[PDB]
Design a protein around this ligand. Structure first.
Ligand code: HEM
Ligand code: HEM
Ligand SMILES: C[C@H](O)[C@H](O)[C@H]1CNc2nc(N)[nH]c(=O)c2N1
Ligand SMILES: C[C@H](O)[C@H](O)[C@H]1CNc2nc(N)[nH]c(=O)c2N1
Ligand SMILES: N=C(NO)NCCC[C@H](N)C(=O)O
Ligand SMILES: N=C(NO)NCCC[C@H](N)C(=O)O
Ligand SMILES: [Zn+2]
Lengths: 400, 400
């Protein structure tokens, strides 16, 4: 079964021959589709497959080298219950994990990833060092560079290395007596965990949280990022002179730190990664979602729009100007950022590159299509096939 | 398996116990999800089930009446290869077909549908009469009322009744010598079929096509809607005084006429239905799709936006004003129209009503979510389960 995939804008069609090699762990069946679900989910066999992928990538499949690596991997597994990846294999796997991520619209840059090997890490203190270096390299004074830092793999009879925060840089969410929240509502739990672990909080709306880092079988320890390491952008609007007076801002580096990296059957519970922002992520979701900063009303009011009726599309106008504020501000502060039109246009290219490369691309339509102006971007008119290939980035339960 | 369905805005969760009774004819499998695909696809057993649904609806399940109807249906089928529905059964089935439509955001009104029985239809001439009547009742001078006209079912050894047009009112699409299209490009084929059947075309941008109606085993015949019957809205903007000068307009009645209605195993190849418009359908899709009227550029330019770069979000700003044009124009002309915020908000209520009623609701996230401001509407933050229940409206091959 090679699903026909059609682009309704140009009428072109392709056949996804790659899906037939995916993992049968999706939530859909012939009876019902569960694709809108946020959470849709032998070591030897997985390892062998990954080793095979690796040798094919360097074009040395079937070589003595390939054979040796297979026997070696099997020996380690049969002898220890796990195995050790080689440095180049790790770099290869990390890049495929990103490449394979169905929900990522920035995958055309997949081959340009900087992997930091942090597998000889021994303490949360060293963990903090590796993280500060990651933030330094990646942030790069605003000319952001994609990177990932891989900490020790999951071990037989050993606790995991875990970063409790969901992102390396997050704003505190302080729940008020009156039920409101000062800061980011999405971060109330982690904020309260930091406080409960000894952190003295700061009553601000954009207070960068400390890191709660965990080494195998240890309580988590608190670590404060130096202000100098955390680049932020103050928000202003090119024409709405009053926007700036709102005192809004956002950090430069989106670094996801709560997902698990799986390469050839091996699991790395702590393996932070980051690229750069796509405007809708901040402008639409972070700032306009009712349970996030929730600023639409104030902005609409300041724009003096008719908030009385829904047909005035006050919400649409405010949202758009806020996304404009984010783009303008990042470009001003000279911090890397890409808008949804450019982002999706590049993904259409990535899809083309992959059809020629692997004969298909795992994509999640609901996440690829932007939270605003969906039909105005080319991906909306593009049919997609969603599946789970490996290596991969996966979700995992919170460590507490 | 009762899929848990969560609303990420409020955090509430439900379990769809209705999907377990769906038809296993969807395109997804545990290996891959084909939910973004536009086209995802015994009479006795189907009939009995429908009859059972009907008797449950009137609360007379297990009655002598229920039993008689079962035996009767079976006798007709065993005797003729088909069977005839009763008027009340037809009315009930048509309403369930709408209710079951996963891609319809206007389903909260499902119970207020006016079914017109046109099953005694004998010619294309009479077919044209019922259509004009449908247009009159439904249009209702601008206070649109949802309705459907059911023409004779598909028969053993007999051609079908078919309406060649996709909608009752469509604008011609005239392909120009220079490769351009004057009118609606989506209607080039039907336009050329009309011409090919004797229609003398009209080189305009908004020329209402004639109907190409087909009666069993007949060539299609052309029929011209009297201008009087087709209500249209000229488009203007509340503030952009020049918008009107663009000479844009759209018809009031969206009446889909190419879909098949399936009730208890019976198929009605001709059974046009209509409700009223949701603004995004016209403003975003019909007017902004690159292969539709494609007016973004011109409007952006007239709004004097920086068309130079994508980060100015010129496309987003024009699109919003155009949707504003549509809404304001229909409200001015006093023609029924609903905006995406109101539409999606009503669907959230429909979902709640159905959870209580049938323990679930078949919905296609990709279609329920509007083509603009997706995350600004509550449906975006709502997980959905998509499946195919019966009765239903289905797609079918074009009759030529
Ligand atoms: C190159 C610049 C990048 C851009 C513009 C980008 C953009 C995006 C966007 C818009 C999403 C949708 C998720 C959301 O709405 O929160 C996403 C998801 C994702 N990105 Fe990419 N990304 C970039 C780089 C990377 C890199 C370097 C990796 C890993 C090596 C990565 C891994 C992922 C994963 C795993 C997801 C899914 C996250 C989830 O499921 O919550 N991204 N990205
Ligand atoms: C009552 C006012 C109504 C509103 C506001 C409404 C709105 C919508 C919208 C926004 C869509 C998305 C499809 C598209 O973008 O073309 C849709 C689809 C659909 N509507 Fe509803 N509709 C209404 C009434 C009806 C009625 C009365 C029926 C049948 C009795 C119906 C049957 C359908 C079907 C079958 C689809 C899917 C069409 C397709 O798959 O191409 N609608 N409607
Ligand atoms: C339920 C639904 O899938 C969920 O709200 C999704 C939809 N698409 C998304 N797409 C992106 N990029 N980011 C998100 O957080 C979401 N949320
Ligand atoms: C490929 C893609 O699914 C297709 O363009 C869909 C997306 N969602 C849609 N949603 C609605 N309401 N109407 C449409 O025509 C479409 N088209
Ligand atoms: N671009 C990335 N990662 O590198 N996106 C991941 C999610 C980020 C999230 N939407 C935020 O803005 O907080
Ligand atoms: N409301 C309905 N049907 O009743 N919508 C579906 C058809 C409308 C179609 N998208 C058009 O505007 O051409
Ligand atoms: Zn699916």
């Amino acid at each position: 079964k090679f699903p026909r995939v059609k682009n309704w804008e140009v009428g072109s069609i392709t056949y996804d021959t790659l899906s037939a090699q995916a993992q049968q762990d999706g939530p859909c069946t012939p009876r019902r589709c569960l694709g809108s679900l946020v959470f849709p989910r032998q070591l030897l066999s997985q390892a062998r497959d990954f080793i095979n992928q690796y040798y094919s990538s360097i074009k040395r499949s079937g070589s003595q080298a390939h054979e040796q690596r297979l026997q070696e991997v099997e020996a380690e597994v049969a002898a220890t219950g796990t195995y050790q990846l080689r440095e180049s294999e790790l770099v290869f796997g990390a890049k495929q994990a990103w490449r394979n991520a169905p929900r990522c619209v920035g995958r055309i840059q997949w081959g340009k990833l900087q992997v930091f090997d942090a597998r000889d890490c021994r303490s949360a203190q060293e963990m903090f060092t590796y993280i500060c270096n990651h933030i330094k390299y990646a942030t790069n004074r605003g000319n952001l560079r994609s990177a990932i830092t891989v900490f020790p793999q999951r071990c037989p009879g050993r606790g995991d290395f875990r970063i409790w925060n969901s992102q390396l840089v997050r704003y505190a969410g302080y729940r008020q007596q009156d039920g409101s929240v000062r800061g980011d509502p999405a971060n109330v739990e982690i904020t309260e965990l930091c406080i409960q672990h000894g952190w003295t909080p700061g009553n601000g709306r954009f207070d960068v949280l400390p890191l709660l880092l965990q080494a195998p079988d240890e309580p988590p320890e608190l670590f404060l990022l130096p202000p100098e390491l955390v680049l932020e952008v103050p928000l202003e609007h090119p024409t709405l002179e009053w926007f700036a007076a709102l005192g809004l801002r956002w950090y430069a580096l989106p670094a996801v730190s709560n997902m698990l990296l799986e390469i050839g059957g091996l699991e790395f519970p702590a393996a932070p990664f980051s690229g750069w922002y796509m405007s809708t992520e901040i402008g639409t979701r972070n700032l306009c979602d009712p349970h996030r900063y929730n600023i639409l009303e104030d902005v609409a009011v300041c724009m003096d729009l008719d908030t009385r009726t829904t047909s005035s599309l006050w919400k649409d106008k405010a949202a758009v100007e806020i996304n404009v504020a984010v783009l303008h501000s990042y470009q001003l502060a000279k911090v890397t950022i890409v808008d949804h039109h450019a982002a999706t246009a590049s993904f259409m290219k990535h899809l083309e590159n992959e059809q020629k490369a692997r004969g298909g691309c795992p994509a999640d339509w609901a996440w690829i299509v932007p939270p605003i102006s969906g039909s105005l971007t080319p991906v909306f008119h593009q049919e997609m096939v969603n599946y789970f290939l490996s290596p991969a980035f996966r979700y995992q339960p919170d460590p507490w």
